[PDB]
Design a protein around this ligand. Structure first.
Ligand SMILES: [Zn+2]
Length: 257
């Protein structure tokens, strides 16, 4: 029943999901002056050369690009992570206007959108078990700003017309998520949660410092999606972001000096 509107959005989620007010919630504001360089962080390893995308789905809240995670193909390791985390999906959050849309903020700066590459810890066998663990998931977050087009995003943009409404999916094989990454892997990391219901506190967040640029035209096509299902009154899929939550007793670590 949850969504992003006035009557079902982030300020309501706590009634069905009391962990919304928990000690480990995401997103957060990243205060760059308070975050500390951590020389114990190891190099981050993003190994997507054997990634196998399968399908793209409009789930009524965003669209997910889904991957075959039955094998160690696309994996995240290193940085703050112990062991191997397998990519299962990515999706975005974005605004109705270029001045908002990201979930994490940087010194209170909101970006136009934010990409989440979702990975689960292979020591727990599958995603469903991983989300019962405090180190079950690792999400790589990448900010998007409006400027030059991102060529690696276009295949995504061009298929959204086929998945306009909730429940629609399309085949989406041979998509390469390397083309969504910025040049630098400098990042901030902290322990947090899923940013949508059920808001489970299972995530090691890795937020890249360098945004990618996308064109105004690319984001405008995101904003033509629908939260509603086919044949229902149109409610544009915009502002599907949760605002920053209290940092509470957490530390944000930087990978860079
Ligand atoms: Zn997300």
């Amino acid at each position: 029943n949850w969504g992003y509107g006035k009557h079902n959005g982030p300020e309501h989620w706590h009634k069905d999901f009391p962990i919304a007010k928990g000690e480990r919630q995401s997103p957060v504001d990243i205060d760059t002056h308070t975050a500390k360089y951590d020389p114990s962080l190891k190099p981050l390893s993003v190994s997507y050369d054997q990634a196998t995308s399968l399908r793209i789905l409009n789930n009524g809240h965003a669209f997910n690009v889904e991957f075959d995670d039955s094998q160690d193909k696309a994996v995240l390791k290193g940085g703050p992570l112990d062991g191997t985390y397998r990519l299962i999906q990515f999706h975005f959050h974005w605004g109705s206007l270029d001045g908002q849309g990201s979930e994490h903020t940087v010194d209170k700066k909101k970006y136009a959108a934010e990409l989440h590459l979702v990975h689960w810890n292979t020591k727990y066998g599958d995603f469903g078990k991983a989300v019962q663990q405090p180190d079950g998931l690792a999400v790589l977050g990448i900010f998007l700003k409006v400027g030059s087009a991102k060529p690696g995003l276009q295949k995504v943009v061009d298929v959204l017309d086929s998945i306009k409404t909730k429940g629609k999916s399309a085949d989406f094989t041979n998509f390469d998520p390397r083309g969504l990454l910025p040049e630098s892997l400098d990042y901030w990391t902290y322990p947090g949660s899923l940013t949508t219901p059920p808001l489970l506190e299972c995530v090691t967040w890795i937020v890249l410092k360098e945004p990618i640029s996308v064109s105004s035209e690319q984001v405008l096509k995101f904003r033509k999606l629908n939260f509603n299902g086919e044949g229902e009154p149109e409610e544009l899929m915009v502002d599907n972001w949760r605002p920053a939550q209290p940092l509470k007793n957490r530390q944000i670590k930087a990978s860079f000096k």
